[PDB]
Design an enzyme around this catalytic site. Sequence first.
Site, PDB file in Angstrom:
ATOM      1  N   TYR A 163      -0.718  -3.062 -17.837  1.00  0.00           N
ATOM      2  CA  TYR A 163      -0.771  -2.322 -19.123  1.00  0.00           C
ATOM      3  C   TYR A 163      -2.236  -2.341 -19.558  1.00  0.00           C
ATOM      4  O   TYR A 163      -2.739  -1.294 -20.012  1.00  0.00           O
ATOM      5  CB  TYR A 163       0.134  -2.961 -20.174  1.00  0.00           C
ATOM      6  CG  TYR A 163       0.191  -2.200 -21.473  1.00  0.00           C
ATOM      7  CD1 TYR A 163       0.686  -0.908 -21.520  1.00  0.00           C
ATOM      8  CD2 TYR A 163      -0.271  -2.760 -22.651  1.00  0.00           C
ATOM      9  CE1 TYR A 163       0.737  -0.197 -22.706  1.00  0.00           C
ATOM     10  CE2 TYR A 163      -0.230  -2.062 -23.846  1.00  0.00           C
ATOM     11  CZ  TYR A 163       0.276  -0.775 -23.874  1.00  0.00           C
ATOM     12  OH  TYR A 163       0.322  -0.073 -25.054  1.00  0.00           O
TER      13      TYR A 163
ATOM     14  N   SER B 262       2.461   4.245 -20.808  1.00  0.00           N
ATOM     15  CA  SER B 262       1.444   4.514 -21.858  1.00  0.00           C
ATOM     16  C   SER B 262       0.059   4.115 -21.342  1.00  0.00           C
ATOM     17  O   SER B 262      -0.377   4.678 -20.321  1.00  0.00           O
ATOM     18  CB  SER B 262       1.778   3.800 -23.140  1.00  0.00           C
ATOM     19  OG  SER B 262       0.850   4.136 -24.161  1.00  0.00           O
ATOM     20  N   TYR B 263      -0.599   3.171 -22.021  1.00  0.00           N
ATOM     21  CA  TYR B 263      -1.949   2.720 -21.595  1.00  0.00           C
ATOM     22  C   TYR B 263      -1.856   2.260 -20.140  1.00  0.00           C
ATOM     23  O   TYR B 263      -2.788   2.528 -19.364  1.00  0.00           O
ATOM     24  CB  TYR B 263      -2.469   1.617 -22.520  1.00  0.00           C
ATOM     25  CG  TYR B 263      -3.968   1.441 -22.521  1.00  0.00           C
ATOM     26  CD1 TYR B 263      -4.647   1.052 -21.379  1.00  0.00           C
ATOM     27  CD2 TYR B 263      -4.712   1.674 -23.664  1.00  0.00           C
ATOM     28  CE1 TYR B 263      -6.023   0.894 -21.373  1.00  0.00           C
ATOM     29  CE2 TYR B 263      -6.088   1.521 -23.676  1.00  0.00           C
ATOM     30  CZ  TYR B 263      -6.747   1.128 -22.527  1.00  0.00           C
ATOM     31  OH  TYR B 263      -8.111   0.974 -22.527  1.00  0.00           O
TER      32      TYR B 263
ATOM     33  N   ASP C 190       8.689  13.347 -25.848  1.00  0.00           N
ATOM     34  CA  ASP C 190       7.951  12.098 -26.174  1.00  0.00           C
ATOM     35  C   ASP C 190       7.123  12.333 -27.442  1.00  0.00           C
ATOM     36  O   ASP C 190       6.370  13.322 -27.475  1.00  0.00           O
ATOM     37  CB  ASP C 190       7.114  11.627 -24.983  1.00  0.00           C
ATOM     38  CG  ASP C 190       6.392  10.310 -25.208  1.00  0.00           C
ATOM     39  OD1 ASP C 190       6.425   9.804 -26.347  1.00  0.00           O
ATOM     40  OD2 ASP C 190       5.818   9.790 -24.233  1.00  0.00           O
TER      41      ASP C 190
END
Lengths: 730, 754
Positions: free
Chosen positions: B535, B618-619, B696
Amino acid sequence: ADSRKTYTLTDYLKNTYRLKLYSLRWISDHEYLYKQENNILVFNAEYGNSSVFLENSTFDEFGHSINDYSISPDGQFILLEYNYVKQWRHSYTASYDIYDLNKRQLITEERIPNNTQWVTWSPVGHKLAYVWNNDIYVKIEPNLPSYRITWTGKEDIIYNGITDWVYEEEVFSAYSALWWSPNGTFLAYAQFNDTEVPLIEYSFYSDESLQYPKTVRVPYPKAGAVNPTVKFFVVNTDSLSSVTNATSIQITAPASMLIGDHYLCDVTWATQERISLQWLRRIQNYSVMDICDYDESSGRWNCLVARQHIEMSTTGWVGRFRPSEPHFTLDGNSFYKIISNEEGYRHICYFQIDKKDCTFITKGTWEVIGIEALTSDYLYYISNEYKGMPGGRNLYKIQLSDYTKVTCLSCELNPERCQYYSVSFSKEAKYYQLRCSGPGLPLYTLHSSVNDKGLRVLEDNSALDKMLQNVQMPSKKLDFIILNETKFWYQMILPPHFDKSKKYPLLLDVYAGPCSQKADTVFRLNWATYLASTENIIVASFDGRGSGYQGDKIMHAINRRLGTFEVEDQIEAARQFSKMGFVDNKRIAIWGWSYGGYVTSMVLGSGSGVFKCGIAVAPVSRWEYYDSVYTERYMGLPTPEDNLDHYRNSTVMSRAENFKQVEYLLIHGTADDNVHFQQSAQISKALVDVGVDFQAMWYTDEDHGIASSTAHQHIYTHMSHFIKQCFSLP
Amino acid sequence: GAAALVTIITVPVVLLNKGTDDATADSRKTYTLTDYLKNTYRLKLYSLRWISDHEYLYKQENNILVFNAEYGNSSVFLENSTFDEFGHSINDYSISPDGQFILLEYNYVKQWRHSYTASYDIYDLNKRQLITEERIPNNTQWVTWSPVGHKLAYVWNNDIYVKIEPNLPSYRITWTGKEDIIYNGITDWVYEEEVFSAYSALWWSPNGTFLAYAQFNDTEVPLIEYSFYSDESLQYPKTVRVPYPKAGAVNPTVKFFVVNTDSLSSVTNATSIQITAPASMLIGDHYLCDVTWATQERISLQWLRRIQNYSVMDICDYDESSGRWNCLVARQHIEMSTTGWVGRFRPSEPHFTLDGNSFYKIISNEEGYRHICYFQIDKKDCTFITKGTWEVIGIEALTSDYLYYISNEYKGMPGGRNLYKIQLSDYTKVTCLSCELNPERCQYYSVSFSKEAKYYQLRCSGPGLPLYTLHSSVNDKGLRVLEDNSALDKMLQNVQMPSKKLDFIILNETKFWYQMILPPHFDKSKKYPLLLDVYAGPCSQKADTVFRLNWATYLASTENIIVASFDGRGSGYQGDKIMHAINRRLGTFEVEDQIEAARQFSKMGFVDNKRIAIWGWSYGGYVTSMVLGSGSGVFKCGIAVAPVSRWEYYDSVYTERYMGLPTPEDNLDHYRNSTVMSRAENFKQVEYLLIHGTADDNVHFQQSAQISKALVDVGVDFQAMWYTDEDHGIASSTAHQHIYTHMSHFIKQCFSLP
Ligand SMILES: *[C@@H]1O[C@H](CO)[C@@H](O[C@@H]2O[C@H](CO)[C@@H](O[C@@H]3O[C@H](CO)[C@@H](O)[C@H](O)[C@@H]3O)[C@H](O)[C@H]2NC(C)=O)[C@H](O)[C@H]1NC(C)=O
Ligand SMILES: *[C@@H]1O[C@H](CO)[C@@H](O[C@@H]2O[C@H](CO)[C@@H](O[C@@H]3O[C@H](CO)[C@@H](O)[C@H](O)[C@@H]3O)[C@H](O)[C@H]2NC(C)=O)[C@H](O)[C@H]1NC(C)=O
Ligand SMILES: *[C@@H]1O[C@H](CO)[C@@H](O[C@@H]2O[C@H](CO)[C@@H](O)[C@H](O)[C@H]2NC(C)=O)[C@H](O)[C@H]1NC(C)=O
Ligand SMILES: *[C@@H]1O[C@H](CO)[C@@H](O[C@@H]2O[C@H](CO)[C@@H](O)[C@H](O)[C@H]2NC(C)=O)[C@H](O)[C@H]1NC(C)=O
Ligand SMILES: *[C@@H]1O[C@H](CO)[C@@H](O[C@@H]2O[C@H](CO)[C@@H](O)[C@H](O)[C@H]2NC(C)=O)[C@H](O)[C@H]1NC(C)=O
Ligand SMILES: *[C@@H]1O[C@H](CO)[C@@H](O[C@@H]2O[C@H](CO)[C@@H](O)[C@H](O)[C@H]2NC(C)=O)[C@H](O)[C@H]1NC(C)=O
Ligand SMILES: *[C@@H]1O[C@H](CO)[C@@H](O[C@@H]2O[C@H](CO)[C@@H](O)[C@H](O)[C@H]2NC(C)=O)[C@H](O)[C@H]1NC(C)=O
Ligand SMILES: *[C@@H]1O[C@H](CO)[C@@H](O[C@@H]2O[C@H](CO)[C@@H](O)[C@H](O)[C@H]2NC(C)=O)[C@H](O)[C@H]1NC(C)=O
Ligand SMILES: *[C@@H]1O[C@H](CO)[C@@H](O[C@@H]2O[C@H](CO)[C@@H](O)[C@H](O)[C@H]2NC(C)=O)[C@H](O)[C@H]1NC(C)=O
Ligand SMILES: *[C@@H]1O[C@H](CO)[C@@H](O[C@@H]2O[C@H](CO)[C@@H](O)[C@H](O)[C@H]2NC(C)=O)[C@H](O)[C@H]1NC(C)=O
Ligand SMILES: *[C@@H]1O[C@H](CO)[C@@H](O[C@@H]2O[C@H](CO)[C@@H](O)[C@H](O)[C@H]2NC(C)=O)[C@H](O)[C@H]1NC(C)=O
Ligand SMILES: *[C@@H]1O[C@H](CO)[C@@H](O)[C@H](O)[C@H]1NC(C)=O
Ligand SMILES: *[C@@H]1O[C@H](CO)[C@@H](O)[C@H](O)[C@H]1NC(C)=O
Ligand SMILES: *[C@@H]1O[C@H](CO)[C@@H](O)[C@H](O)[C@H]1NC(C)=O
C-alpha cells in the site's frame, strides 16, 4: 511445405497488401473527376485522355488540409472542407472555403461559417445551402450574403435540415434533410423535434489533461420511448428575399400517419413541381407514399388522396429497412419502385400517378437488389439471379417497351474473377463504371451504354496480385446446406493448403441481423484472413432464417421473435459444419459484433455445448435498451398488450448461468453512441452475480466501431490471443 | 533392488516408505479460497457497550443483555421477541443515557463509507411501548442522543431538528438545508472521507445545554459525474453527480455554530451564535479539523489552512452577558511543520481535564516522534510528559489520577500495541498494563474503558487468536475473559494454516520492518513465488502483529506463495523523518524502496527470482502500477485494483496535504511527472490486470480509464475487468467473490502454478 509468407496479423493491423480502387465523380455524360497525386483530373470518358483540373499547388498554399472537395454542377466554384470534426456515423462539422475556378481566386466575402454541419451545391448551378446552429441558410451566389430560412433551430432540441441521432443511424441513414428541386428552384427541408425524446447520458474522459469527465447526453429514443416529431417544409430558393424572412410551405403528412407516431422514411423529387413523400406509422407495417404537386394559384403544395399508394405487410415489416426510392420517369406521371410480389420475392413494379395497379416488370425466385439508372430505352438494375446465387450481384437492363427483352450486362464478363458486380452510371447513363469486389481481386472497368462495350480497365489491382502470389492467401468456399428443405448458404475461409483428411478448428463469425447476408462472394483482406492463413482456423459464416436477399419468407421468419430462430440456426449450422468432417468438434468457437455479439451471447448461453469459447464486441443485451426504430421494426412495442413477453425472454442476462460452460470475452467502448455501454454493463453484472468467470476489456472513449488506429490494433490483438489460447494454438 | 534381496527388498521398500513419510506425511486440509470467500473459519468478537461505570450492554442470541462487570452476572435488557412484532428488521439500536428510551434503526440505506439514511422508531423502555407520536422522519441522515438525559437531535433534508422529549414535537434549528449545496449537521464527501472521517457534524454540549453544528457550503465545489446502471429494469442509466474537490479545485466552505437547546421554543426560531475561525485561518481556505467540547461553557476547535502546514486550536468560552462565545488570542495554540504536513492525517483530538483549565494532546517532539504534551489553557508552553524513540499511538482514557495511552514502545516494535498508564502527579511513574499479559498470543492491543474508567475491556488482535478480556482499573486486576475464540482455534488446528514472520531489513543504516506470510511446511532451502502485497501510503503500516484470515492466507496455504509487505520511506508510527520523507514527492521514494524490498527478499534465499509479483488497492494500486512501470524488471506481473493515476484526479485535501498545489508555482512539475500514464511504455515488459468499480466514489473510474487508454495507445496487452455499480470497496458479496476468483486465476497463470 510452401516457403511463401502467411498473411500475419501485422499485415492486417498495418495494412500492407492494399486493394487499389478507382473512385471517380461523374461531372457530365462524357467526363468525370478522378484525383491523382493530389491533382483533380478530368478524363474524357470515351476518348480516355486526361486533362489536369486542379493542380495540387492550387491548394498547396491553402494553409489548411482539405478533407474533401466538392465541385459545383456548373464547375464555376469548388467547396473545400477543412477543420473536419466527425460526430456520429454521418454527422460531422467542418469549415468550408468556396474557391472560384473561373478567376482562380478564393472567395473571401460572406464565407461559409465555421463548424458548418452540412453544405450542398444546387442540382444545376452554383447555389449553396449550408446548415449552421441547427438552422438552414441559402446562398443564391457563392460571393453573396447568405439568406436565413429557419429561425427556431435549437441544439439537441429542434433539428432543422439535419437528421437527429435515431434518423441519422436508422431512417434517412444520413445527416442531410435538405432536398433541392431538380432545377434548384425549391428547397425541401425537414424539422425534427426531440423535445420529449429522452437523453442517453454517457461519460467522456477526453484526454489526460481534462480534470473532470465530460458527461455527454444524446437525444436517443430507446425501445418504447417517445420518438422524435418530423415536419416537412418546402421553400422557394429563387424567390429568396433579403428584406423579408422566406416563407416555408409545410406539407402535411398522410392522414393515416397523423393518427399516431409517423416516420418520413424518404423524400423524392418527381418533377420541378412534383415531390413524393413516403411515410410509415409507428408500427412499421403500414406505409403511404404521397405524390404532392405544387399549385401556382395558391402557391401551396397539395397532396392528392387518389395518388396516395399504401403498402402493408402482415408477414413482417414493410420495406427491408424503409420503402425504396421511387425512380420517377421524366414526365413524372409514372414511377418504378422495388416492391415484394405475392410470392414474397422483391421485384421492380411500374406504377402511374393516376393508376392504382402494380405492374411488376420482373419475376422469379431471385430478388432485385437495387435500381441503377432509368433511361427511356432500358431500366438498369442489380440482381442476384445469376447462377441462382443470393450472394451474387450482376447488372441487368430491361427494355421498357418490351419487358421480355431483359439483358445481363456483366454476368458473362469475367465469371471466375468477378461475381459481385456493382455499377455507377454517368449523368445521362451514357457511360457506366462496372466494379467487381469478388471473388477475385477488385476490378474497375468503364463501359458504353450505347453498345454495351468496355471502354477500358480503370483498375485491375494487378500490383496486389503478384504480391498475393507470394503469400499463402486462404481460399474462400461458398456453398449451401439444405435445412428443412430451405436452402441456406454458408461461406468458409478454408485455411491455405486445405486437406479434409486433417482436422481444423472452426470459428463461426456471426451477425444474423434481420435482412443480413454473411455468405457473399466479395473478396476481403480481414482478421479472418490472418486466422486462416497463420492460425490455420476455418473461419465460417451462415445465413439462416432472418437472412436477407433470399425472399420475405426467410427474412420475416424472425418477425416479433428476435434472438430466437436466428440463434438456433447458427448453432444448427455449427453442428452441420462439425459433421462435415474437417471441423474439430472439440475446438469450435463463435465471434460477433452488435447483433452478431447478441447472437454470440445467446448461442454461448444456449447451453448447446457445441461452442467452446466466444468473443462478443459491443453486444446488445436487452432489446428495451436499444433504439425504438430498430427494435420496433423487428419486435414490436415493449408493452404488456403487445410483445413485452418476447422482450423479457430475449435478454442475454437470462442465460447467464449457462455461460459457466464456455469462455466469454466481453469488449465494449465506453463512448458507444449506438449500442450503449449499458448493454455490456448489465451482461457483466449478471455474469458476476451468477458467478460465471469471464474475461472483459473496456476501451476508453471508443465508439461502436472502435476504429481508432490504436484501439483497432489492440482489440484485434487481444481477440487473437483469446482465440489462440482457447483453440490451444501456439 | 532387483538382486538376491527378496523379502529383504520388500523390507527395504518398507524402510524407504517410512523415510518418505518422515519427510512428508501431511494429510491436513489447506485454507482454500472457498474457506476465505464463505468465511468457513470465522473469528468471534465481544464488542460490549459501556453504558455505565459498572455495567455494559452485550448482544447474545439477539437478546440485549446488561452485564455487571464486578459481579460478572447478566440480565435481559430487551428480549429478542420484544421487537419480533416490530415488523421491520432493526439494523441497529441506540440506548438513551437515562436508559428510559431506545432508537430502533430500520430501512437502513448506505451512501458512502460513513454517510447513510435510515428510518428511526423511539421505544419507551419504561412503558415497554413504541413512541407513536412525533416519530423520527424517514430518510433521516443522522440521529444522536444527548450526552446525558434523553434529548434527541437529528439531521433531516440537510437540516438539524431537536426533540427535547421523544414524545414531544421536533424544534427545527436550521432552515438553509439543500442537497449537494448546503450541508447542515452532516459532512460533505470530502470532509466525510478525509477531515472528520464521519457523517456527523453535530456536537452535543457535555450536559446537553448547547448543540454545536457546522454548515458546509459546496455551491462552488465542482461535481464528479459517473453513470449508474441500477438494475435490468432501468431503461435509461442515471448519471450520479457528487461534490468532489479534485486537487486544486474549489474546496468547500466550513462555518461553525452553537445553539442553546435549553432555550428552544415553538413560538420563534432558535438563534445560533457563530464562532468564526482565527484570522490566521481566515486569510485563505481553511478546514475545521475537529471539535472537542471541554467544559459546559468551553469548547475547542482545530482549524487548518488549505496548505496543511499551519494549524491553530481555538479554545472558545461562552460569555453569559453577551450570549456570544469568545476566543482569547493567547489561549490559541499554533502548530506548524516545516518538514511536512501537520498531524498524521489531521490535528489530533485534545483530551481536556474535568476542571477544563488544562488538557493533554499528542504533539510530535523536536526529535520527530509524536508524544503526549500537557497544555494549560492560560500557558503557551508545551511540556512533554512522555518521550523516546517510540510514539504515543493514541490516548484512550484520562482519569484524574492516571492517563491511559497505547504505544509501540514494547520491544521497540512499530506494529506492536500495548496499554500504558502514567501517574499524572508523577510522570516518571508509567506502568504497562498489557505488555506482560500474554506476549506469546497478544502483542497488538486495543482498549475500551467504562464511563469513569473503573473497568476496561482489553481486546487483542494478535499475533495469536483474537482474545477479549475485561480488567478492573482499581488494582489492574483481570476480571475475566469475554471471548477466547477457542472454537475457531480447534477448527484451525485441523487446517495447515500458514505462519507469519515480522522482522526488519537495514537500508542506508535505517531499520525498515517487513512481514512475510510464509507458507506451511516452509523450507528455507526451497524457493517460493513471492507476491509483494503493498500500500505504501503516507503514514501507513503494512507490517504489523495482527492475526488475519484473508486472500493471502489462501495464497500461502494452498498456492504456497510467500506474501510479503514492506514499510519504507512514508510508513507511519516510525517517526516524522520516515513519514515526512515523501513530502511534496509522492510516487518517488516509496516506489523505489518497494522495488528494493523485492530485491532484498530475492537474495534472502527462498524467493524465486523469475517469479515475483505485486498487488495493491488505491495508493497500493498506484504503487503497483508505478513499480510495474518503473522498468525495474524485478517483478514479473501485477494486479492493480481501483488504482490512483494522475494525482490531480484525487481529492484535494488528501493530495494537497502531501504533493502540494497543482499550480505552476508549486509542485505542478511532479503532478505531471508522477502520472502512471507516463510509464506506459515500460508496462510492455510486465503483465497487468486493471480492475476498477464503475461507480467508485473515492478513486474515480476516470483515473483507471486514462491508464487503460494510455496502455492501448502505447501497445501494452493487459487484462481488465469493470465491476458495474461497485464502490471503491467492491465488497458486494457477488463482486467480492468474483474479484478474488479472477485475481486468483491471474496470479496462478502468471506464477505458472499447477
Ligand atoms: C417540440 O415539441 C414540444 C412538445 O410538444 C413543444 O413544446 C410545446 O410548446 C408549446 C408552445 O406554445 C406549448 O404550448 C403551450 O405551453 C404552455 C406551457 O409551456 C401552456 O401553458 C399553454 O397552454 C400551451 O399548451 C406546449 O405545451 C409545449 N409542449 C410541451 C412542453 O410538452 C415544442 O414547441 C415543439 N417545438 C417545435 C418547434 O415544434
Ligand atoms: C454558498 O456559497 C455561495 C457562493 O459564494 C453563496 O452564493 C452567494 O450568495 C450571496 C448572497 O448575498 C450573493 O451575493 C449577492 O449576489 C447578488 C447577485 O446574485 C447581488 O445582487 C448582491 O448584491 C450580492 O452580491 C453571491 O453572489 C452568491 N454567489 C454565487 C451565487 O455564486 C451562498 O449564499 C452560500 N450559502 C450559504 C448558506 O452560505
Ligand atoms: C481528348 O481528345 C479529344 C480529341 O481527340 C478532345 O476533343 C476535343 O477537345 C477540344 C478541347 O478544346 C475541343 O475544342 C474539340 O472540339 C474536341 N473535339 C471533339 C470531337 O469533341 C477531348 O477534349 C480530349 N479530352 C480531354 C479530357 O483532354
Ligand atoms: C425573421 O425571424 C427572426 C426570428 O423570429 C426575427 O428575429 C427576431 O426579431 C424580433 C424583432 O422584434 C426580435 O425581438 C427577436 O429577438 C429576433 N430574434 C428571435 C430569435 O426572435 C426577424 O426579425 C425576422 N425577420 C423579419 C424580416 O421578419
Ligand atoms: C424550375 O422549376 C420550377 C418549377 O416548375 C419553375 O417554377 C415555375 O416555372 C414555370 C415555368 O417557367 C412558371 O410559369 C411558374 O410561374 C414558376 N413558378 C414559380 C413559383 O416560380 C422555375 O421557373 C424553373 N426554373 C427555371 C430556370 O426553369
Ligand atoms: C401491424 O402490427 C400490429 C401489431 O401486431 C397489428 O395490430 C394487431 O393486430 C392483430 C390482428 O392482426 C390484433 O390481434 C392485435 O390485437 C393488434 N394489436 C396488437 C397490440 O398486437 C396491426 O394490425 C398490424 N397492421 C397490419 C396492416 O398488418
Ligand atoms: C431468542 O433468544 C432465545 C434464547 O436463547 C433463543 O432460543 C434458543 O434457541 C437455540 C437454538 O434453537 C436453542 O439451542 C436454545 O436452547 C434456545 N433457548 C431458549 C431458552 O429457548 C431464540 O432462538 C432467539 N430467537 C431469535 C429470533 O433469535
Ligand atoms: C449481580 O448480582 C448482584 C447481587 O450479588 C446484584 O446487585 C443487587 O441486585 C439487586 C437486584 O434486586 C438489587 O436490589 C441490589 O440493590 C443490587 N446491589 C448492588 C450493590 O447493586 C446485581 O444487580 C446483579 N447484576 C446483574 C446485571 O444482574
Ligand atoms: C423561522 O424561519 C423560517 C425561515 O425563514 C420561517 O419560515 C418562513 O417564513 C416566511 C415568512 O414570510 C415565509 O415566506 C417562508 O416561506 C417560510 N419558510 C421558509 C422555508 O423560508 C419561519 O416562519 C420562522 N419561524 C418563526 C416563528 O419566526
Ligand atoms: C448545563 O451547563 C450549562 C452551562 O454551564 C448550565 O447553564 C448555566 O447554569 C448556571 C447554574 O444553574 C447558571 O447560573 C447559568 O446562568 C447557566 N447559563 C446559561 C447559558 O443558561 C446549565 O444549567 C447546566 N444544566 C444542568 C442541568 O446542570
Ligand atoms: C507551508 O508550505 C508552503 C509551500 O511549500 C510554504 O511556502 C513556501 O515557503 C518557502 C519559505 O519557507 C518559500 O521559499 C516558498 O516560495 C513558499 N512557497 C512555495 C510555493 O513553496 C510555507 O512557508 C509553509 N509554511 C510553513 C509554516 O512551513
Ligand atoms: C502535384 O502534381 C504534380 C503534377 O505533375 C505531380 O508531379 C506532383 O508529384 C504532385 N505532388 C504531390 C505532393 O502530390
Ligand atoms: C474560422 O475560425 C478560424 C480560427 O479563428 C479563422 O481563422 C477562420 O477565418 C474562420 N472562418 C470563418 C469562415 O469565419
Ligand atoms: C415513514 O414511512 C412509513 C411508510 O410510508 C410511514 O408509515 C411512516 O409514518 C413514516 N414516518 C415518518 C415519521 O414520516
